[PDB]
Amino acid sequence: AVVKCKPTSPGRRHVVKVVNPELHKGKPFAPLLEKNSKSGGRNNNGRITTRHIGGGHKQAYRIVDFKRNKDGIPAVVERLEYDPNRSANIALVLYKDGERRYILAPKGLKAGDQIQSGVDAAIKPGNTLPMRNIPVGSTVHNVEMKPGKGGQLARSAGTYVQIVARDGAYVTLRLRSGEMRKVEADCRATLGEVGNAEHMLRVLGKAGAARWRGVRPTVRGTAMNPVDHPHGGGEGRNFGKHPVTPWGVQTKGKKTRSNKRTDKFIVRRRS
Amino acid sequence: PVIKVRENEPFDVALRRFKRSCEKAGVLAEVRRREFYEKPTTERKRAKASAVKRHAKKLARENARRTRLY
Amino acid sequence: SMQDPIADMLTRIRNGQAANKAAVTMPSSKLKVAIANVLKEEGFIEDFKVEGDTKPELELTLKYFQGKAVVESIQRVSRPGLRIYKRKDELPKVMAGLGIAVVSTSKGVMTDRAARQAGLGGEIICYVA
Amino acid sequence: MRHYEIVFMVHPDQSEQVPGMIERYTAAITGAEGKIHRLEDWGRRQLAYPINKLHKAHYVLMNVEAPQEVIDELETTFRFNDAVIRSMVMRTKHAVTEA
Amino acid sequence: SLSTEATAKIVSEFGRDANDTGSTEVQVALLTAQINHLQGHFAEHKKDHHSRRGLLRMVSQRRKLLDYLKRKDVARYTQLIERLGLRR
Amino acid sequence: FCRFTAEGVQEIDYKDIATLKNYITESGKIVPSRITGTRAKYQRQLARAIKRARYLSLLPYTDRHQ
RNA sequence: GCUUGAGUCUCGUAGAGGGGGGUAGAAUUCCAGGUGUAGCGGUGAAAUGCGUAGAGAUCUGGAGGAAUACCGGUGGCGAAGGCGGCCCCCUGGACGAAGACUGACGCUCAGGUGCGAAAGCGUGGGGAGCAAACAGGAUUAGAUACCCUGGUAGUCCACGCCGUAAACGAUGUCGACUUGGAGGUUGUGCCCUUGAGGCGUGGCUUCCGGAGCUAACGCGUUAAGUCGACCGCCUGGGGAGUA
């Protein structure tokens, strides 16, 4: 559950951690592992393109099945595994014929649960259906944005998507940010809500925890010099300017969606 | 509420039917109740005071009013 | 929850005299029978009848002089929260000797003057006046 | 084994599928332990308010003596079925005999 | 709420016969069985304070009956506390 | 006078909407017991059955509603 | 030892008793469109506010949140706080008829422990309506108030904390006794169902009153009458339920 630490050190004082007993204590399934080389936020020209990224514990990539193509075949949840690459936990899933796959774990999902994908399966949490046969009002996760593409929406821990309306070929969903968005009804979705919903409560205690989660320190623009940032400079803490990105674009209010080709699929703006 | 005017009828009689029907249905009383919110203390006190005033009228009428006055 | 049945007998007697009842029934007991016997001797009741086999009751026929009740007042003295014991020269006088003080002494239940003549004190039960 | 009354209302345009539905519902119950005490197929009548802008639903009534979990499965069936538009289930004291 | 055949099974396990339904041992065993079933109930719902007051009435009643049985007969009391699994 | 005692029924059923239609008013409200004279427990059963028949669209809630 | 107190079983009843989940209908607001026009809203009177960028009115569709009109009752249930659509699942207590069983197992309770309205606190959601604070317009000598137009916390949910109220029938809990009358509510028994009935017998409850009590008001078989057991409390007003 949610375990607070006892203040036997200051960095140990402010720690709240998420202890999960049902996570399987052991090495992961090596047929589904790849290696994951870090970047530091540096692209193929080697320059920093995303700041405040670098360092961190080594982590191996686990191939999570998002598409759920194995249709009309039952599958039993074998265990819950810790994924380092993710906010959620993964579930090792053994199909009836012998194939094992990682899936995103739903909220109510423990070992022994029979799940099934397809167009016909069930409406138990864990089953994957296209959004032609899922009822209006149901809570889905791992929603696709194109048919057969694989599944992009509602994928962090505790997140989900409500099917608001059906109209013709399209399904109006309400995403986790409150944005109402249209999808094609042949896009699949896994029923239920993503588990590990107590993920947001961990408060990390110390700087070293955010340092071994892979995050590198943020210098504020006021602390810098006028060459380095638009905010920089001053004799003892002057600001005097409107807040901006380090490349001189206005932050703190200014909108920057400029797509025009997915604006047709938007029903309401995020609010 | 809905008052269907029968053919060959005077208008004031259909209006009287409508006013009688809205007086039985209790429309303006229930609308006059729902203009301002009353606390449940005020509602239970209004109910208790109404009951005590009703029975103080009845206990006066049934035996304290049957005698002759002059 | 019925901690004193003797005081319950006295209360039934007092409510019967005040309510002008003829006879008062109660559940029976040996000490109740002895106290009612002392009242029947001194003339505050005129009869007492016990009836039942495993469940006995006791009926006291109350006494009335033409308008009022014969017992002017009755009080309980050694209640179970405060038991009152008196030696034979500290024995109580009720209404300057016109009312009886029922005392259960070491030979049995009797009155105050019966205890003073018999020469022994005991546990007071009631003041009958 | 408790005695439930089930009134469920079906679309008029899908009223032709009502009998076979009823059959698998009896096959839902009579296989496990439960008995049907009444099957009073009312038929099609006009509603008092436009449920989903439609009227004239097909009322079906059935009385069961049943275990509880199969009735929970029946309520899950009435949930995701699109033919129904209302379904009340009720736990009565005794069985009911006539119509 | 402890239906009839279960109560019959306890009465003809602790009673002098089937018509004996009111001894201290029968009453303590029926109270203990209902306490265990409600312990199943109060694992969930966790805020049913009224049913928990009903349970606490029957727990204190079982304690009073067992204290009577301890004062009356220590041999039957010790046999019942080894039979039924309560520590004191 | 009470008519549910005069017939002698044990439970007011929600299905016979002739009786429940008789015991409501024209606007859809449950008629008070002080004027129909029904006894107390049959008035409670009457309100229960009228609400249950209101659920199944066997009776309207209001007379007005679209 | 015994069965009168207390308890257990069998069987039926009534119930907003609790906890979880789901669903229905009206209404308010918002969003989108149709029609159509210069007002709407509001007041003791006005103004702020909204409206010619199309308001308010009306029709259709949808989105959410909250509370459950009628029933509704000087009704009911609960130890109190309190509990109102409907349905299901888990569950507590009370009560009645006829029996049977144990055999005083009982009453009260310092300290202790639990439940405990509303407001408030913490974390995570939710947010229609209402609305502290706040703003504007009024009234006024002034108006940091009532009044009006807005409006955040909060009200709602999950989980903990708080532990107080005019938490009140200002009436501790239990047991017994002591004239009555009219009601309500919920069981059960009998007479010919001979008739929307007559007769009793239990529980709970509202009003009036007898003796008695009371400083009086008033209470009055549900006592503030007559008694018993245990507990809590009071000792002039203020300072002070304060340091």
Automatic annotation (TrEMBL), chain D:
Q: Name one GO molecular function term.
A: structural constituent of ribosome
Any idea what this protein is called?
Small ribosomal subunit protein bS6
Q: Which organism is it from?
A: Escherichia coli
Briefly, what is this protein's role? Binds together with bS18 to 16S ribosomal RNA.
Q: Does the keyword Glycoprotein apply?
A: no
List this protein's GO terms for biological process: translation
N6-acetyllysine: residues bearing it: 93
Alphabetized, the UniProt keywords read: Acetylation, Ribonucleoprotein, Ribosomal protein, RNA-binding, rRNA-binding
State the similarity comment.
Belongs to the bacterial ribosomal protein bS6 family.
Q: Name one GO cellular component term.
A: cytosolic small ribosomal subunit
